[PDB]
Design a protein around this ligand. Structure first.
Ligand SMILES: Cc1ccc(C(=O)NC2CC2)cc1Nc1cc(=O)n(C)c2c1cnn2-c1ccc(F)cc1F
Length: 352
């Protein structure tokens, strides 16, 4: 019938005012930017270390308003061990009229894959377990018909016992400048989206996993291009130049035309590339790093691969409920996106 408002308290961290319920204590900044500022906290109600993201003036434009709604809808949907999920969402605002701030609460993680790939020297069993968890989370995400679109080591978060969660799905929107040059922001992207060959699907994320897996196995970035074209050449050297069948799938005439200008190359022998690696790891890599996106292994298919024999459990690899994505094609005003967001904030039910 009803729900009770908690008591809020105010607190400044690095020149920004945080107003949060009393349950959240020991707030400590971890990061900031356009992706919102994030603090670590201790939730006294659940005994959980949590991350709290503040979105300030998330309704300054139509695109900001829609993105705020999108992020909240995304987080509300995900209920899976290997996917970041919403523990709590709140606003200190008492009505829609004063509602101009959104806080999102998730589990606090210990490090990202960039931070761990360094502190440590990973074994094959470590790689098995990390990649298994990524694919387990991806199976769930893809089953809701959500594409991550920007899978990289920086949005894969890990705790001390190597338990992994996927962050930042469905919401990456980089500028041209951020994708230019010798930059990690582009190194994990599938060729078809890097050069906009065609309308992309979920198979884009599997390419990213292959890149991440290779890096975990070798300690080296697989395709560290100095630019879009240099990266493509790195990719084509390994996987071969496109055949006739794939060329007609490239709907972009300019892109298909550039491809045809290149000297044709055969697929390399992956056993001569990833020397000393588990042959099962090499085999899976060959199935993930396929130029034709239609022919790439799926997350669900990859979980059943022999490489994951010690972790695979078909009764413990769940799919998601349907995700209603119809808002994406909808054109609304700021106050309409704001009202929708507000409804989602108040309708939130905490996890058991
Ligand atoms: C609070 C929140 C809100 C939204 C989303 C998200 O993925 N939103 C997209 C899907 C729609 C994620 C989070 N959670 C974190 C955000 C963050 O920036 N960091 C750094 C986080 C978080 C959780 N832990 N950590 C974290 C702390 C310390 C480290 F060393 C390493 C870490 F990953």
């Amino acid at each position: 019938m009803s729900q009770e408002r908690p008591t809020f308290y105010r607190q400044e961290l690095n020149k920004t005012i945080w107003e949060v319920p009393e349950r959240y204590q020991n707030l400590s900044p971890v990061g900031s930017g356009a992706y919102g500022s994030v603090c670590a906290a201790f939730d006294t109600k659940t005994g959980l270390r949590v991350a709290v993201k503040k979105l300030s003036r998330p309704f300054q434009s139509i695109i900001h308003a829609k993105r705020t709604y999108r992020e909240l809808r995304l987080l509300k949907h995900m209920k899976h061990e290997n996917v970041i999920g919403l523990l709590d969402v709140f606003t200190p605002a008492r009505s829609l009229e004063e509602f101009n701030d959104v806080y999102l609460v998730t589990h606090l993680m210990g490090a990202d894959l960039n931070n761990i790939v360094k502190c440590q020297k990973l074994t094959d069993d470590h790689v098995q377990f990390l990649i298994y968890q990524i694919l387990r989370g991806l199976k769930y995400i893809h089953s809701a018909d959500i594409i991550h679109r920007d899978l990289k080591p920086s949005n894969l978060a890990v705790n001390e016992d190597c338990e992994l969660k996927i962050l930042d799905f469905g919401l990456a929107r980089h500028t041209d400048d951020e994708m230019t040059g010798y930059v990690a922001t582009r190194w994990y992207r599938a060729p078809e989206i890097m050069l906009n060959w065609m309308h992309y699907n979920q198979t884009v994320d599997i390419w990213s996993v292959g890149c991440i897996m290779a890096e975990l196995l070798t300690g080296r970035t697989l395709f560290p291009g100095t630019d879009h074209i240099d990266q493509l050449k790195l990719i084509l050297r390994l996987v071969g130049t496109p055949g006739a069948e794939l060329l007609k799938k490239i709907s972009s005439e300019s892109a298909r035309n550039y491809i045809q200008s290149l000297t044709q190359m055969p697929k390399m022998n992956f056993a001569n590339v990833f020397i000393g690696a588990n042959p099962l790891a090499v085999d899976l890599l060959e199935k993930m790093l396929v130029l034709d996106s239609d022919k790439r292994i799926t997350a669900a298919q990859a979980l059943a691969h022999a490489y994951f024999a010690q972790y695979h459990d078909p009764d413990d690899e769940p799919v998601a409920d349907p995700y209603d994505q119809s808002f994406e094609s909808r054109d609304l005003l700021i106050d309409e996106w704001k009202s929708l967001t507000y409804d989602e904030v108040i309708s939130f039910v905490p996890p058991p």
